[PDB]
């Protein structure tokens, strides 16, 4: 039940910037993006230690309430007890999550939604700032 | 039907910073703060030209769907076609609103709420930045 933002109307090309602080006892946190809570074109879930994963980013989609296939990244540029910033955009092919220091993750656009109208944060991540570009 | 943010969990003393761009032909816009759409401890409505009023800030509350006693500020530090930032805090007595950028007025806390969990923007005001401190 973390921060939820609706009616974002984030169209392709536009950038969603999110800055927040990661808890010191961080297990994992979640950034959800899509149309609503049941239609997520991006489930961004860095896991420090959660569900057996250690220092692993887990991405997925949810379509009509149904989870898609999990995609995993070896690179884990997140440290517990620190401030994490992500820049998010998308096109017809992929969603792109960029980190300031150069890290960039791609996740296939599986929902093909016209825009991102929904953002929800959860887990050990307290959002401090959100910008729309 | 503008931006809506829920589960803010804004405790007393904490600052809610909101930046957005006011349309050149703006008639009015709204910042709603409270628990939900039916319970607003602050209805912040600058009216450039609306409901017969002009260059007047209209503040009110909504408690259980019912509008409280409307109140107005003689001062109007908003320009159509320009970027406006509003900083908002509250104690158990008043809400404090900081307008661009020397301006500060108190609005009585009439809902007594523990925290601000709900923000909704509307009217001729496209949100570009929201910060929580
Ligand atoms: O079929 C059961 C599966 O369940 C998921 S976890 C589940 O998956 C989703 C992603 O698809 C969401 O992350 C979801 N979620 C998290 C939150 C949340 C809520 C609040 C805060 C916060 F932070 C987070 N809400 N929803 C998770 O519960 C397991 O990973 C998966 N599995 C696959 C592997 C696996 C392990 C090692 C290597 C490998 F390749 C795969 N290790 N487990 C398998 O056991
Ligand atoms: O009952 C009649 C009253 O009606 C309100 S209008 C009403 O006020 C509410 C707050 O008090 C809400 O703002 C409400 N609202 C706005 C929006 C919205 C929704 C979407 C976008 C967007 F931008 C905005 N939604 N809801 C308004 O409709 C007038 O203030 C009021 N009155 C007028 C005067 C008055 C008149 C002339 C001169 C003068 F000095 C005072 N002095 N009192 C009086 O005539």
Residue numbers in the entry:
A (entry chain B), B (entry chain A): 2 to 134
Article excerpt on this structure:
Galectins are small, soluble lectins characterised by conserved β-galactoside-binding site (subsites C and D) within their carbohydrate-recognition domains (CRD, ~130 amino acid residues), and they can form multivalent lattices with membrane-associated glycosylated ligands. All the observed CRDs of galectin family adopt a typical β-sandwich fold composed of two antiparallel β-sheets of six strands (S1–S6, S-sheet) and five strands (F1–F5, F-sheet). Concave surface of S-sheet contains conserved amino residues and forms a primary binding groove to which specific glycans up to a length of tetrasaccharide are bound. In this model, the best structurally characterised subsites C and D are responsible for recognition of the β-galactoside-containing disaccharides, whereas the other subsites (A, B and E) remain poorly understood regarding how they contribute to ligand binding interactions.
